[PDB]
Structure 1
Amino acid sequence: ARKLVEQLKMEANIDRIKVSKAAADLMAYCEAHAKEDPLLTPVPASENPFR
């Protein structure tokens, strides 16, 4: 109906970016935050609150 078609009318009028650009942004965030990620590398027990 009118409500159902309005639910997706604005979906067409959206800006889609390149998937390569999105992957580059994700890679940049991961690499700029990889250093401060205790789950990636084993955190030393000195600063680890779970000794």
Structure 2
Amino acid sequence: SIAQARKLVEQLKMEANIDRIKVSKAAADLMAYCEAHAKEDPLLTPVPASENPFRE
């Protein structure tokens, strides 16, 4: 039981001592990837029936 408790403390310590960025930057980089690749999304922008392989 003491061994298990020690393991838990050690793990939590490792997970606590990491570097975290601000949610603002994280949210901006998600929005930026989403915006940047919007032209290559067939489900987002319906594809001409000529280029659609599951109909023609």
TM-score for the superposition, normalised by structure 1: 0.85
- Distance (Å, rounded) in 2 between the aligned partners of 1:44 and 1:8: 52
- Distance (Å, rounded) in 1 between the aligned partners of 2:10 and 2:53: 51
Give 1:49 shift: 1.3
Structure 1's unaligned 5+ residue stretches are none
- Cα deviations by residue, 1:2-47 (Å, 9 ceiling, x for unpaired): 1111221111111111111011100110011111111111111222
One of 35, 38, 44 as aligned partner of 1:40: 44
The percentage of aligned residue pairs carrying the same residue is: 100
TM-score for the superposition, normalised by structure 2: 0.79
Calculate the aligned-residue CA RMSD, in Å.
Answer: 1.0
Aligned to 2:17: 13
**Count of aligned residue pairs for this structure pair:** 51
Please say which structure displays the higher CA radius of gyration: 2
Moved over 3 A (4+): none
